[PDB]
Design a protein around this ligand. Sequence first.
Ligand SMILES: [Ca+2]
Ligand SMILES: [Ca+2]
Ligand SMILES: [Zn+2]
Ligand SMILES: [Zn+2]
Length: 164
Amino acid sequence: FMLTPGNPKWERTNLTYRIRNYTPQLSEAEVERAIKDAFELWSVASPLIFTRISQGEADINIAFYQRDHGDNSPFDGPNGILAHAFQPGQGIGGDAHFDAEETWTNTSANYNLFLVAAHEFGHSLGLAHSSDPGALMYPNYAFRETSNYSLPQDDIDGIQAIYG
Ligand SMILES: [Ca+2]
Ligand SMILES: [Ca+2]
Ligand SMILES: [Zn+2]
Ligand SMILES: [Zn+2]
């Protein structure tokens, strides 16, 4: 596994998240379900608890944006970069942005919002990319059955190394 340089970590364990907007490819429910299940993989392997707020200042804000979107790291249209996240911190820290131009799905067709969100959430929690091709934290996307999905061992090792 690989930790974000500088080892940034949340000095807190109950963190809140907020879904600022949705993608019209999927229903709101399915979007909300992908995010919830994505936060839970990490949750069952660490002491972190995740609470959703409908509005207000959450620790981790989630949003789908296009090209330029205020943070100096414009997305690039279809394919290529799918999403990105900010390491732990106050402010934009912890935030996860998804490319609004992608095809978001909840099947095997590219892309599956759950596998990508669970990936972004590791970064928001302080993990960098892993060189283990089987880890969720691998640089490039790959579909894995999601129905009864759980965190690969290399990723468990990773949040464990950070949070215990
Ligand atoms: Ca893209
Ligand atoms: Ca934040
Ligand atoms: Zn962004
Ligand atoms: Zn990544």
